[PDB]
Symmetry: C2
Subunit: 339 residues, 2 copies
């Protein structure tokens, strides 16, 4: 194929080698050409045909390179992204996009100025549970949602853009923005519960959409999780436990190769309750398979065909906007309204 998109991957830690590499590897739309890393042997074993490089320029000055994936650590990655944009490369950034909305806008304007595609890897829009929710919404089984409550907890009692609101909160904020647009206000408590904690490990956010209230919360001393989603509309409620299995499959060295990729466990299928007049019906909904590949098939369609991006820089920046307003709400102890 003359038309493979030539990819350079920045960094080959966990994101590069586990979350991106294996997905890019199964899509013939793509060719992994270069990877910036000192893990020379790992790359030789994972991608025999890739070239290892140790300088950013070896990617930014290479005219054959069309798309750069930025997985370098939170600090140095703004620099790297700008450098890629300056060199006329399309760029996929990890979440959370940046620490501040202002940094994010700067990248967006530089990309627009330069005619390049800038996206943010908010791949939890292709988690099984979330896909299931979008399917229920589109089929009219979850009308006029009035309450949307999402929890994202862990049990990590020992302390091992920092903290869990950036790292985990960003995913469920993106989902919320995706579903309902921007809220008119944010009220939040953002803290460190754990004994010697440096960074945020607890958040509770309320996104004010008037009649609709979106509540997003997460703790780090939570032996057992309640439901991940509790969603209430005029006629029905969707309540579901569990988390998407794709990241664990990827950590176990598995690749997407058949239709059973991203399947949910039957015990974790959501329950939809519907009330028509006097009758109350409860149904177990088999989850739509999770499909992280979809983000990359769409990126390929933006690059080659000019189709709209699967996640846009603006949507990425909006997540950061909610995160900063939450921090500000927590610090000032008041509701932060948004224009």
């Amino acid at each position: 194929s003359l038309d493979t998109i030539k990819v350079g991957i920045l960094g080959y830690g966990l994101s590069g080698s586990v979350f991106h590499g294996p997905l890019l590897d199964v899509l013939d739309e793509y060719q992994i050409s270069k990877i910036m890393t000192s893990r020379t042997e790992e790359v030789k074993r994972d991608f025999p045909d890739a070239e290892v490089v140790h300088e950013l320029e070896e990617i930014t000055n290479d005219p054959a390179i069309e798309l750069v994936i930025v997985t370098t650590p939170s600090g140095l990655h703004y620099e790297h992204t700008m450098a890629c944009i300056q060199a006329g490369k399309h760029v996929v950034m990890e979440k959370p996009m940046t620490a501040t909305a202002e940094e994010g806008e700067t990248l967006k304007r530089a990309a627009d100025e330069k005619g390049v595609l800038l996206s943010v890897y908010h791949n939890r829009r292709w988690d099984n549970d979330f896909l299931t929710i979008k399917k229920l919404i589109s089929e009219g089984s979850l009308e006029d949602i009035n309450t949307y409550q999402v929890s994202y907890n862990r049990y990590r009692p020992e302390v091992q853009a920092t903290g869990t609101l950036y790292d985990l909160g960003s995913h469920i904020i993106d989902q919320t923005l995706h579903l309902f647009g921007m809220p008119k206000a944010v009220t939040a408590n953002v803290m460190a519960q754990r004994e010697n904690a440096e960074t945020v490990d607890y958040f509770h956010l309320t996104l004010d959409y008037g009649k609709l209230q979106a509540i997003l919360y997460g703790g780090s001393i939570v032996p057992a999780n309640g439901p991940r989603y509790q969603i209430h509309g005029k006629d029905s409620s969707f309540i579901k436990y569990g988390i998407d299995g794709q990241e664990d499959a990827l950590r176990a060295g598995r690749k997407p190769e058949d239709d059973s990729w991203g399947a949910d466990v039957p015990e974790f299928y959501g329950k939809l309750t519907t009330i028509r007049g006097s009758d109350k019906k409860t149904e177990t909904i088999p989850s739509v398979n999770g499909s992280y590949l979809t983000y990359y098939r769409k990126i390929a369609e933006s690059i080659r065909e000019g189709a709209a991006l699967p996640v846009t820089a603006e949507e990425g920046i909006n997540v950061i906007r909610i995160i900063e307003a939450a921090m500000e709400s927590s610090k000032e102890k008041r509701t932060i309204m948004l224009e």
Copy 2:
């Protein structure tokens, strides 16, 4: 028995006739003597030996009456309560105690000056689920609770009033009973329903520092999540369902045997405990709910000088939490408690 506590009941609507009358009726420590209502025929069927009266003074100026249950509507009940206190009567008030904490303080002060017992019927302290939670805590099975989330929802899509006073007061009282007063309250209190003129949704955060207590409920909720999600250093308790006693009372049943207030097995809660790497979940059979316990204690207070099952001060604190929440919702900011 020469020693029955002689009861006067004010009002014979739902509270009087369904939630108090039938409990007092099975306890031989009490005699229902007088009921102030216009429902004369109804009292005649239910309590053939009670006297019906039509003015308050027929109860307050009767030297034999020792205890008065105030079930008259929220508005006229501050007035009613004060007269009972002024006449030297012990009083049980329905929840919520009063619209404002200031009103509750006045009632308490007059009770203390007059030397009578003043209590509030926060009977949810004896719901099956909450008794089970309390038992877990006392056995050391929920140590160092860091998160306590309680939901109190209903599906009423068609329209001291509103659900914060009516429902939220129950789960607030439980929270205060477990943990004391928090440092701050942050709340949103509104009407979500299209034609609502009164509160029908609340979401409160009580700030205890590391511990966060979240109390909420809406009125357009087809299926509830857990009523309780409680997380501590080693363990979590998650539980669905509501205590069945009030429904039994509505259907006309009375406490008669050991089966009263039993929870349904499918709504038993789950305790998850983590021991280093070993995580285990155990189903916890619920302790039976026991509203009678409230009234047995009241009788021990009156006859033996025991401490009240719910004090006026506790009742007032519930109201202080409610006012701080309304104020937080209006000012769109966190309200610090004094």
